[PDB]
Amino acid sequence: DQRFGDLVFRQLAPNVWQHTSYLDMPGFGAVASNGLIVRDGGRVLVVDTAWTDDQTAQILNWIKQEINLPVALAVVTHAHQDKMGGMDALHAAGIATYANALSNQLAPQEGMVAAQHSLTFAANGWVEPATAPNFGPLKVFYPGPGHTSDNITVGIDGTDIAFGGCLIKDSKAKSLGNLGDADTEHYAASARAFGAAFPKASMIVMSHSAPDSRAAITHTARMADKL
Ligand SMILES: O=c1c(O)c(-c2ccc(O)c(O)c2)oc2cc(O)cc(O)c12
Ligand SMILES: [Zn+2]
């Protein structure tokens, strides 16, 4: 891992980097939230934001420093502070933000800024290409009601890497995490859906755990199978 200011960066693939944002919570400590940075030719594609806009701006700094390429668009997993904490930073930079239709509807309620674009999903969970213009390797898939009712997952086409967001947990986890607005009935079903959508993905990257194997999906489903 490479320390960069208040954040940590790590390379997973020759064109896929992972960022880690830390939120200082008195009494608990530092909560880490991961994200993905993929390079597509001469453009950069970012998945999710940091805990805060400031930290998100720090990511943009790293991108401009190491990659030196402009960000085409940014896709978030859900309307939560741990993934949509840097919406203003993106808008201030002029980066097009893409989020789920439900996320943009729940964002204002959660106290977050809705994205500029709304992703529409099919009955199979797959994203509608119409609302996904020039996404490239960013394949979006909506598993269903899990961590939230607006959570989505993104797979990096051209690589065996998939992002489980805050839905999927690591194979060494003991808890599912924040189950406040989570669906205790479709959690396992949704978790398994993601695994079926991307069965070739060996590296499952999440937001609160370091990139795990496919065992993370099964583990999450097995834990959610007890709800
Ligand atoms: O992802 C989240 C997260 O990690 C925590 C968190 C984790 C451990 C703690 O001990 C704690 O107090 C909070 O906050 C959250 C609050 C939300 O509304 C939604 C989230 O997704 C998170
Ligand atoms: Zn969340």
mmCIF file of C-alpha atoms and ligand atoms in Angstrom:
data_model
loop_
_atom_site.group_PDB
_atom_site.id
_atom_site.type_symbol
_atom_site.label_atom_id
_atom_site.label_comp_id
_atom_site.label_asym_id
_atom_site.label_seq_id
_atom_site.Cartn_x
_atom_site.Cartn_y
_atom_site.Cartn_z
ATOM 1 C CA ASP A 1 0.000 0.000 0.000
ATOM 2 C CA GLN A 2 1.135 3.540 -0.788
ATOM 3 C CA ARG A 3 0.489 6.311 1.730
ATOM 4 C CA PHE A 4 -0.686 9.544 0.124
ATOM 5 C CA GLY A 5 -1.568 12.322 2.533
ATOM 6 C CA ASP A 6 -4.700 11.324 4.405
ATOM 7 C CA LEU A 7 -5.478 8.432 2.071
ATOM 8 C CA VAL A 8 -3.930 5.130 1.004
ATOM 9 C CA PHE A 9 -3.624 3.844 -2.562
ATOM 10 C CA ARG A 10 -2.903 0.380 -3.915
ATOM 11 C CA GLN A 11 -2.606 -1.050 -7.420
ATOM 12 C CA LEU A 12 -4.657 -4.149 -8.193
ATOM 13 C CA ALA A 13 -4.206 -4.297 -11.947
ATOM 14 C CA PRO A 14 -1.975 -2.459 -14.506
ATOM 15 C CA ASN A 15 -4.947 -0.153 -15.191
ATOM 16 C CA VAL A 16 -6.946 -0.596 -11.975
ATOM 17 C CA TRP A 17 -6.084 1.222 -8.753
ATOM 18 C CA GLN A 18 -7.813 1.132 -5.373
ATOM 19 C CA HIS A 19 -8.172 4.063 -2.987
ATOM 20 C CA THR A 20 -8.900 4.036 0.741
ATOM 21 C CA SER A 21 -10.537 6.949 2.566
ATOM 22 C CA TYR A 22 -10.508 7.187 6.364
ATOM 23 C CA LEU A 23 -13.153 8.885 8.474
ATOM 24 C CA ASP A 24 -12.228 9.926 11.997
ATOM 25 C CA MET A 25 -14.993 8.847 14.350
ATOM 26 C CA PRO A 26 -14.453 9.732 18.043
ATOM 27 C CA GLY A 27 -14.736 6.692 20.268
ATOM 28 C CA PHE A 28 -14.418 4.219 17.413
ATOM 29 C CA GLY A 29 -11.423 5.177 15.302
ATOM 30 C CA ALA A 30 -10.903 5.433 11.566
ATOM 31 C CA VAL A 31 -13.442 3.906 9.192
ATOM 32 C CA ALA A 32 -11.940 2.902 5.863
ATOM 33 C CA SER A 33 -13.871 3.169 2.607
ATOM 34 C CA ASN A 34 -12.352 1.751 -0.588
ATOM 35 C CA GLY A 35 -12.974 2.735 -4.187
ATOM 36 C CA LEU A 36 -11.841 1.900 -7.720
ATOM 37 C CA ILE A 37 -9.916 3.920 -10.297
ATOM 38 C CA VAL A 38 -9.806 2.494 -13.828
ATOM 39 C CA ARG A 39 -7.972 3.937 -16.820
ATOM 40 C CA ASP A 40 -9.629 3.554 -20.220
ATOM 41 C CA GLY A 41 -7.248 4.745 -22.887
ATOM 42 C CA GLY A 42 -6.829 8.454 -22.375
ATOM 43 C CA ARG A 43 -9.652 8.862 -19.881
ATOM 44 C CA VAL A 44 -10.103 7.964 -16.218
ATOM 45 C CA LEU A 45 -13.192 6.309 -14.740
ATOM 46 C CA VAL A 46 -13.808 6.462 -10.994
ATOM 47 C CA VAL A 47 -16.133 4.268 -8.958
ATOM 48 C CA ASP A 48 -17.585 5.764 -5.757
ATOM 49 C CA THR A 49 -16.271 8.760 -3.825
ATOM 50 C CA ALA A 50 -14.615 9.333 -0.452
ATOM 51 C CA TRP A 51 -16.158 10.015 2.958
ATOM 52 C CA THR A 52 -15.863 13.752 2.396
ATOM 53 C CA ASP A 53 -15.497 16.108 -0.569
ATOM 54 C CA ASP A 54 -12.057 17.126 0.666
ATOM 55 C CA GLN A 55 -10.853 13.529 0.587
ATOM 56 C CA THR A 56 -12.467 13.091 -2.813
ATOM 57 C CA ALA A 57 -10.498 16.088 -4.078
ATOM 58 C CA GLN A 58 -7.377 14.368 -2.742
ATOM 59 C CA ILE A 59 -8.164 11.413 -5.001
ATOM 60 C CA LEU A 60 -8.436 13.732 -8.001
ATOM 61 C CA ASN A 61 -5.020 15.094 -7.052
ATOM 62 C CA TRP A 62 -3.535 11.606 -7.082
ATOM 63 C CA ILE A 63 -5.187 10.864 -10.430
ATOM 64 C CA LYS A 64 -3.772 14.059 -11.952
ATOM 65 C CA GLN A 65 -0.354 13.309 -10.455
ATOM 66 C CA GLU A 66 0.123 9.617 -11.279
ATOM 67 C CA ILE A 67 -2.157 9.162 -14.289
ATOM 68 C CA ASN A 68 -2.313 12.799 -15.472
ATOM 69 C CA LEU A 69 -5.515 11.976 -17.354
ATOM 70 C CA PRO A 70 -8.947 13.633 -17.024
ATOM 71 C CA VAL A 71 -11.885 11.857 -15.392
ATOM 72 C CA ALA A 72 -14.686 11.121 -17.852
ATOM 73 C CA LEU A 73 -17.409 10.189 -15.379
ATOM 74 C CA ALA A 74 -17.958 8.868 -11.869
ATOM 75 C CA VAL A 75 -20.345 6.101 -10.843
ATOM 76 C CA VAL A 76 -21.443 5.577 -7.239
ATOM 77 C CA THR A 77 -22.813 2.384 -5.689
ATOM 78 C CA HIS A 78 -25.529 3.930 -3.486
ATOM 79 C CA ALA A 79 -26.790 7.082 -1.760
ATOM 80 C CA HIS A 80 -24.699 6.695 1.383
ATOM 81 C CA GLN A 81 -22.169 9.015 3.026
ATOM 82 C CA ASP A 82 -19.520 6.277 2.864
ATOM 83 C CA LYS A 83 -19.689 6.272 -0.943
ATOM 84 C CA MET A 84 -21.325 9.581 -1.887
ATOM 85 C CA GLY A 85 -19.458 11.842 0.499
ATOM 86 C CA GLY A 86 -17.649 13.604 -2.300
ATOM 87 C CA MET A 87 -20.394 14.646 -4.696
ATOM 88 C CA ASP A 88 -19.704 18.385 -4.589
ATOM 89 C CA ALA A 89 -16.003 17.810 -5.232
ATOM 90 C CA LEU A 90 -16.930 15.995 -8.442
ATOM 91 C CA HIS A 91 -19.405 18.666 -9.546
ATOM 92 C CA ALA A 92 -16.857 21.359 -8.703
ATOM 93 C CA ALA A 93 -14.336 19.568 -10.901
ATOM 94 C CA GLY A 94 -16.896 19.244 -13.675
ATOM 95 C CA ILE A 95 -17.060 15.469 -13.666
ATOM 96 C CA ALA A 96 -20.329 13.870 -14.780
ATOM 97 C CA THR A 97 -21.857 11.887 -11.941
ATOM 98 C CA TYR A 98 -23.860 8.726 -12.590
ATOM 99 C CA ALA A 99 -26.020 7.142 -9.896
ATOM 100 C CA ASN A 100 -28.989 4.792 -9.596
ATOM 101 C CA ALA A 101 -32.438 6.319 -10.131
ATOM 102 C CA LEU A 102 -33.473 5.357 -6.598
ATOM 103 C CA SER A 103 -30.194 6.667 -5.189
ATOM 104 C CA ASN A 104 -30.853 10.110 -6.688
ATOM 105 C CA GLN A 105 -34.289 10.001 -5.072
ATOM 106 C CA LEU A 106 -33.049 8.903 -1.643
ATOM 107 C CA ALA A 107 -29.912 11.071 -1.713
ATOM 108 C CA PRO A 108 -31.726 14.334 -0.687
ATOM 109 C CA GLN A 109 -33.441 12.396 2.102
ATOM 110 C CA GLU A 110 -30.151 10.973 3.330
ATOM 111 C CA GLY A 111 -28.669 14.456 3.205
ATOM 112 C CA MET A 112 -26.523 13.796 0.162
ATOM 113 C CA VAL A 113 -26.310 15.520 -3.218
ATOM 114 C CA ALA A 114 -27.917 13.500 -6.003
ATOM 115 C CA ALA A 115 -25.880 12.755 -9.125
ATOM 116 C CA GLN A 116 -26.356 14.523 -12.448
ATOM 117 C CA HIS A 117 -27.336 11.313 -14.218
ATOM 118 C CA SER A 118 -29.713 8.539 -13.222
ATOM 119 C CA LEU A 119 -29.057 4.925 -14.205
ATOM 120 C CA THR A 120 -32.048 2.845 -15.235
ATOM 121 C CA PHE A 121 -32.031 -0.898 -14.664
ATOM 122 C CA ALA A 122 -33.749 -3.793 -16.385
ATOM 123 C CA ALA A 123 -35.861 -6.561 -14.822
ATOM 124 C CA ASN A 124 -32.795 -8.805 -14.858
ATOM 125 C CA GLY A 125 -30.776 -6.311 -12.850
ATOM 126 C CA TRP A 126 -28.557 -5.242 -15.745
ATOM 127 C CA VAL A 127 -28.122 -1.535 -16.423
ATOM 128 C CA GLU A 128 -29.891 -0.044 -19.423
ATOM 129 C CA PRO A 129 -27.259 0.958 -22.033
ATOM 130 C CA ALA A 130 -29.419 3.996 -22.827
ATOM 131 C CA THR A 131 -28.586 5.566 -19.471
ATOM 132 C CA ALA A 132 -25.004 4.343 -19.715
ATOM 133 C CA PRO A 133 -23.352 6.414 -22.478
ATOM 134 C CA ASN A 134 -19.637 5.698 -22.963
ATOM 135 C CA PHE A 135 -19.239 3.626 -19.801
ATOM 136 C CA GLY A 136 -16.606 1.455 -21.411
ATOM 137 C CA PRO A 137 -15.446 -1.330 -19.059
ATOM 138 C CA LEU A 138 -17.768 -0.133 -16.281
ATOM 139 C CA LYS A 139 -20.527 -2.734 -16.383
ATOM 140 C CA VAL A 140 -23.247 -1.875 -13.883
ATOM 141 C CA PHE A 141 -25.520 -4.479 -12.314
ATOM 142 C CA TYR A 142 -28.309 -4.071 -9.766
ATOM 143 C CA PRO A 143 -28.464 -7.180 -7.534
ATOM 144 C CA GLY A 144 -31.506 -6.100 -5.568
ATOM 145 C CA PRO A 145 -32.398 -5.143 -1.975
ATOM 146 C CA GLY A 146 -29.324 -5.797 0.151
ATOM 147 C CA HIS A 147 -27.351 -3.215 2.143
ATOM 148 C CA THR A 148 -29.940 -0.765 0.854
ATOM 149 C CA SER A 149 -32.671 -0.719 -1.771
ATOM 150 C CA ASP A 150 -30.609 1.433 -4.134
ATOM 151 C CA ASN A 151 -27.282 -0.429 -3.948
ATOM 152 C CA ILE A 152 -25.678 -1.447 -7.216
ATOM 153 C CA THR A 153 -22.546 -3.328 -8.207
ATOM 154 C CA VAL A 154 -19.992 -2.607 -10.931
ATOM 155 C CA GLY A 155 -17.800 -5.048 -12.820
ATOM 156 C CA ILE A 156 -14.619 -4.084 -14.653
ATOM 157 C CA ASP A 157 -14.981 -5.583 -18.131
ATOM 158 C CA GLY A 158 -11.707 -6.794 -19.580
ATOM 159 C CA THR A 159 -10.590 -7.890 -16.147
ATOM 160 C CA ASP A 160 -11.519 -10.509 -13.552
ATOM 161 C CA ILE A 161 -12.249 -7.794 -11.009
ATOM 162 C CA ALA A 162 -15.648 -6.793 -9.640
ATOM 163 C CA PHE A 163 -16.802 -4.225 -7.087
ATOM 164 C CA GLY A 164 -19.235 -5.472 -4.459
ATOM 165 C CA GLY A 165 -19.566 -2.050 -2.852
ATOM 166 C CA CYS A 166 -20.807 -2.140 0.730
ATOM 167 C CA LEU A 167 -23.116 -5.048 -0.028
ATOM 168 C CA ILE A 168 -20.596 -7.871 -0.264
ATOM 169 C CA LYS A 169 -18.415 -8.635 2.744
ATOM 170 C CA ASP A 170 -15.050 -10.382 2.965
ATOM 171 C CA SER A 171 -14.702 -14.127 3.540
ATOM 172 C CA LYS A 172 -13.261 -13.381 6.985
ATOM 173 C CA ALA A 173 -16.088 -11.136 8.150
ATOM 174 C CA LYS A 174 -18.297 -11.926 11.140
ATOM 175 C CA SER A 175 -20.954 -9.301 10.516
ATOM 176 C CA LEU A 176 -22.773 -7.892 7.486
ATOM 177 C CA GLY A 177 -22.107 -4.355 8.660
ATOM 178 C CA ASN A 178 -24.693 -1.581 8.807
ATOM 179 C CA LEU A 179 -28.073 -3.283 8.435
ATOM 180 C CA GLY A 180 -30.152 -0.200 9.174
ATOM 181 C CA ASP A 181 -31.815 0.323 5.805
ATOM 182 C CA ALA A 182 -30.781 -3.141 4.684
ATOM 183 C CA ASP A 183 -33.177 -5.790 3.431
ATOM 184 C CA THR A 184 -33.013 -8.771 5.761
ATOM 185 C CA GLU A 185 -35.037 -10.898 3.329
ATOM 186 C CA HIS A 186 -33.402 -10.295 -0.065
ATOM 187 C CA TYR A 187 -29.841 -9.802 1.198
ATOM 188 C CA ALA A 188 -28.696 -13.342 0.380
ATOM 189 C CA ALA A 189 -30.649 -13.396 -2.892
ATOM 190 C CA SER A 190 -29.053 -10.124 -3.986
ATOM 191 C CA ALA A 191 -25.572 -11.209 -2.882
ATOM 192 C CA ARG A 192 -25.904 -14.402 -4.913
ATOM 193 C CA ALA A 193 -27.199 -12.413 -7.887
ATOM 194 C CA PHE A 194 -23.970 -10.416 -8.027
ATOM 195 C CA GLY A 195 -21.950 -13.624 -8.002
ATOM 196 C CA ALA A 196 -24.008 -15.003 -10.866
ATOM 197 C CA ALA A 197 -23.747 -11.799 -12.890
ATOM 198 C CA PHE A 198 -19.953 -11.799 -12.653
ATOM 199 C CA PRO A 199 -18.855 -15.467 -12.302
ATOM 200 C CA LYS A 200 -15.488 -14.838 -13.945
ATOM 201 C CA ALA A 201 -14.496 -12.181 -11.421
ATOM 202 C CA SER A 202 -11.859 -13.646 -9.109
ATOM 203 C CA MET A 203 -11.043 -10.411 -7.314
ATOM 204 C CA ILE A 204 -14.000 -9.032 -5.398
ATOM 205 C CA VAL A 205 -13.243 -5.526 -4.181
ATOM 206 C CA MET A 206 -15.454 -3.987 -1.521
ATOM 207 C CA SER A 207 -15.610 -0.742 0.441
ATOM 208 C CA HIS A 208 -14.829 -1.932 3.981
ATOM 209 C CA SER A 209 -12.448 -4.779 3.240
ATOM 210 C CA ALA A 210 -9.370 -5.413 1.106
ATOM 211 C CA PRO A 211 -9.939 -7.206 -2.261
ATOM 212 C CA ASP A 212 -11.010 -10.770 -1.543
ATOM 213 C CA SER A 213 -11.768 -13.848 -3.625
ATOM 214 C CA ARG A 214 -15.126 -15.253 -4.729
ATOM 215 C CA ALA A 215 -15.336 -16.801 -1.266
ATOM 216 C CA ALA A 216 -16.376 -13.359 -0.063
ATOM 217 C CA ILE A 217 -19.620 -13.607 -2.031
ATOM 218 C CA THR A 218 -20.483 -17.059 -0.710
ATOM 219 C CA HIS A 219 -19.556 -15.976 2.810
ATOM 220 C CA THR A 220 -21.805 -12.934 2.591
ATOM 221 C CA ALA A 221 -24.676 -15.043 1.260
ATOM 222 C CA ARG A 222 -24.150 -17.641 3.989
ATOM 223 C CA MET A 223 -24.311 -14.929 6.646
ATOM 224 C CA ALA A 224 -27.330 -13.280 5.033
ATOM 225 C CA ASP A 225 -28.954 -16.712 4.811
ATOM 226 C CA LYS A 226 -29.491 -16.431 8.554
ATOM 227 C CA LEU A 227 -31.739 -13.381 8.420
HETATM 228 O O1 LIG B 1 -20.466 2.011 5.959
HETATM 229 C C1 LIG B 1 -20.803 2.499 7.035
HETATM 230 C C2 LIG B 1 -20.002 2.360 8.160
HETATM 231 O O2 LIG B 1 -18.845 1.649 8.082
HETATM 232 C C3 LIG B 1 -20.417 2.964 9.343
HETATM 233 C C4 LIG B 1 -19.945 2.535 10.576
HETATM 234 C C5 LIG B 1 -19.135 1.410 10.680
HETATM 235 C C6 LIG B 1 -18.690 0.979 11.923
HETATM 236 C C7 LIG B 1 -19.057 1.673 13.073
HETATM 237 O O3 LIG B 1 -18.625 1.248 14.288
HETATM 238 C C8 LIG B 1 -19.868 2.795 12.973
HETATM 239 O O4 LIG B 1 -20.236 3.469 14.097
HETATM 240 C C9 LIG B 1 -20.312 3.227 11.727
HETATM 241 O O5 LIG B 1 -21.260 4.030 9.297
HETATM 242 C C10 LIG B 1 -22.211 3.939 8.328
HETATM 243 C C11 LIG B 1 -23.414 4.615 8.499
HETATM 244 C C12 LIG B 1 -24.387 4.578 7.503
HETATM 245 O O6 LIG B 1 -25.559 5.245 7.670
HETATM 246 C C13 LIG B 1 -24.155 3.859 6.336
HETATM 247 C C14 LIG B 1 -22.957 3.175 6.165
HETATM 248 O O7 LIG B 1 -22.751 2.469 5.021
HETATM 249 C C15 LIG B 1 -21.985 3.218 7.161
HETATM 250 ZN ZN ZN B 2 -24.173 2.278 2.472
#
